[PDB]
Amino acid sequence: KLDIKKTFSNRSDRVKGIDFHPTEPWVLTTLYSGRVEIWNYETQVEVRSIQVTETPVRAGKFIARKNWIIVGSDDFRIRVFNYNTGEKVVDFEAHPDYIRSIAVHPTKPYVLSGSDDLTVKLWNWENNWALEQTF
Amino acid sequence: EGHEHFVMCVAFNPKDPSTFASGCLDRTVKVWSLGQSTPNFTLTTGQERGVNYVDYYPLPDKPYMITASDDLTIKIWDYQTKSCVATLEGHMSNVSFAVFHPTLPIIISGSEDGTLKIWNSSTYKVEKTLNVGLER
Amino acid sequence: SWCIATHPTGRKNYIASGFDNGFTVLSLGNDEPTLSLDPVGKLVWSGGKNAAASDIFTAVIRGNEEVEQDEPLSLQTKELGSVDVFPQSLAHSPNGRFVTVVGDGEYVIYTALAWRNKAFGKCQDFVWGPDSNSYALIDETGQIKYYKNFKEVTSWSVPMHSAIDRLFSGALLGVKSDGFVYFFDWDNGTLVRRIDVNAKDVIWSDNGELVMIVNTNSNEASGYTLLFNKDAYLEAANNGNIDDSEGVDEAFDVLYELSESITSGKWVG
C-alpha cells in the first residue's frame, strides 16, 4: 500500500525534461517547443517562463547552490539562467549535435552533457565553463 | 576523407561547381571545395539513420540543400546558416531521394513505400502522391 | 511519458513526470521520520543517508550539546542493528527497554540495549500496553490480538462490528473504526467509552488522566482535550450498567478544543 496523491497537474506542450528544486516547492520543465518553465506545484502558481530557443529543449536541471537552471537543447547549446531574475548566465555550443542529458555533480562545479555526437563532455563552471574532458 | 560511414550521394553545387556535397550514412553532409583536404563545413542533419541523398536547389534566390533518410524524413537546409528550413513528413518507408525540380516550384521524393511524392517548394505541403505500381 | 524526477531529498516522497501533454507531480506517501526517543534521551531511528533503510542506529542526547535553539545537535551516532523488513514505524515500549519495528504486514521486537530479538509475527498495526510488557496488534485477518510477555492472551478479546482502521496506545487501548474512536480496558478489553470524533491520533498524558484527540479535520476543531475519570468507569463496570455502543458517559469530560493544526504533541503535566 502506497498512499498516492495527485498534488498537481498542468497541460502544456510535450515536456522532455523535468527537475525538482531541493528547497523550494518548484519543478522545472523543459519543453519540445523551446520553452522552459518553473512551477510552484504546491501553490499551483507558475514562477517563471523562458523562451530559450525555437528548438526542443531535452534536458534541464536546477543548480540551487548558484540559483541557476541549466538547459540543453537541439540547437546544440547549453544555456544557464538565474531563476531569481531570468538572467542569462552563459550560452555556448557544447556539441555539434543534439543534447540528450545533463548531470550535475553534487559537490564539485561539474556538469556532464550527453549528446548525439556519441560523446559525453565534462564542463567546469569554476573555470569559465571550460571543457575539461570528453569521453 | 572525413566521413565516418558509407558515402551515399555526391553532388556538385550547380551555382559554384568548385564546391560539392557528400551525403553520408554518418548522419552528416559535408561540403568541400576542390583542392582542399578538409571540408568547408560539416552539417549534422539530426536524421538518426543517415543521409541517403543530397541535392542543391538550382536557383540563385536561395542557398538551399535537401537531404533524404531512412528515418522517413526529408529536411531542407540553408547551407549558410546551417539551419533546417523545413521537414517533410509523410513517407511510410525509407526515403531513397529528394530533389528540387529545375523549373517547377516543387520537390520530388521517392521511397521504398513504392511512392513518388511531389511537394510545394514554398508551403512544403505534399501536393501529389502517385504509385506507378513498380514497387520500391 | 518522457521524463521523470524525484525529490532530491524525498520531501513528501514527491515525484514528477513529463508527457506529450504536460506534467504531473505526485506524492507517494507521508515522509514522517521513522524514529523514537526513550524516556531519558536515547534516540533510535532507521535509515538515513549512506545507510540501508533497514539499518537501525542510536544516539544519546546529553545535557552537554552546546549549540543554539536554531542549530541541529551533534550526537554520537552508533549502529544498533539491522532489521529484515522496510521500517515503516519505530517505537520504544513506554519502558525504553524494547523497540518495535513494523514493516509491511510484519512486526519485530528487540531489546533497546544489545538488540536481542524478542518477538515477530504478521501484523497490520501495533501498540504498546502501559505495561511495557504487553501489546495489541491487528493480525492479517483484520482482528485485534492481545499479548502479555510476548505471549498471546487467547480468551482476551474486543469484538468489533466494523473494520479496524488502527490502534492507539495510552491509558486505555484506542481503536479507530466506523469514524469513531473506541477505548477499551487493557486487561479485559471491556468498552469504556466511544468518542464521536474522526481521530487522526490519540495522545495520553503521563498519568493517564488527560488525553488529546487529534481530529482528522478534513474540512471544525483540530483537536479535543478530555479528562479521564478512571473511578467513574470502575464504578459503572461494577454496577454492570455499561452501554455496549458508547460505554460510560461519566468516564470522560470534554475540557477544551484547539483551533491550530496538530502535527505532533506530547504532554508535560
Q: How many whole angstroms separate alpha carbon C154 and alpha carbon A61?
A: 59
Cα dihedral across residues C247, C252, C253, C256: positive or negative: negative
Residues 107-126 of A with CB under 8 A from B: 116-117
Measuring CA to CA, which residue among A92, A97, A103, A104 is closest to residue A119?
A97
Q: Do chains B and C touch (3 or more CB pairs under 8 A)?
A: no
Strand pairing report for C78-82 and C89-92: unpaired
Q: How many whole angstroms separate alpha carbon A37 and alpha carbon A24?
A: 14
Q: What's the grid cell of residue C48? A: 538515513
Q: Do chains A and B touch (3 or more CB pairs under 8 A)?
A: yes
What are the φ/ψ torsions at residue A125 (nearest 5 degrees)?
A: -75, -10
Q: What is the DSSP letter of B136?
A: -
Q: How many whole angstroms separate alpha carbon C142 and alpha carbon C215?
A: 24
Write out the H or E segment, with its range, that includes residue C233. Answer: helix C230-239
Contact B46 A74 (CB under 8 A): yes
Q: How many whole angstroms separate alpha carbon B41 and alpha carbon A67?
A: 38
Write out the H or E segment, with its range, that includes residue C165. Answer: strand C164-168
Nearest-neighbour CA in chain A from C103: distance (Å): 11
Residues of A in contact with B4 (CB under 8 A): none
Determine the longest span between alpha carbons in chain A, in angstroms.
Answer: 49
CA angle C81, C105, C15 (to 5 degrees): 85
Contact A4 C27 (CB under 8 A): yes
Q: What is the DSSP letter of C234?
A: H
Tell me how far CA of residue A4 lies from CA of A1, A28, A71, C13, in angstroms: 9, 21, 30, 10
Q: How many whole angstroms separate alpha carbon B86 and alpha carbon B82?
A: 12
Measuring CA to CA, which residue among B9, B135, B23, B136 is closest to residue B79?
B23
What are the φ/ψ torsions at residue C237 (nearest 5 degrees)?
A: -65, -35
Q: What pairs with residue C119 in β-bridges?
A: C109
Residue pairs between chains A and C whose CB atoms are closer than 8 Å: 73
Residue A96 at interface with chain B, using a CB cutoff of 8 Å: yes
Residues of C in contact with A27 (CB under 8 A): 5, 16, 23, 25
Q: How many whole angstroms separate alpha carbon C47 and alpha carbon B99?
A: 64
Query: What is the CB neighbour count within 10 angstroms for residue A38?
Result: 23
> Which of C2, C8, C26 shows the shortest C-beta gap to A15?
C2
Q: How was this structure determined?
A: X-ray
DSSP per-residue string spanning C42-56: EEEEE--TTS-TTEE
What contacts C41, CB < 8 A, 6 or more positions away? C60, C61, C62
Q: Quick check: B109 and B101 in contact, CB under 8 A? A: no
Contact A96 B42 (CB under 8 A): yes
Q: How many whole angstroms separate alpha carbon A135 and alpha carbon A49?
A: 33
Contact C25 A7 (CB under 8 A): yes
Nearest-neighbour CA in chain A from C212: distance (Å): 26
Query: What is the CB neighbour count within 10 angstroms for residue C260?
Result: 7
Tell me how far CA of residue C146 lies from CA of C128, C154, C184, in angstroms: 10, 8, 12
| CA end-to-end span of chain C | 55
> Which of A16, A22, A27 shows the shortest C-beta gap to C25?
A27
Contact C24 A8 (CB under 8 A): yes
Contact A96 B46 (CB under 8 A): no
Q: How many whole angstroms separate alpha carbon C10 and alpha carbon C31?
A: 7
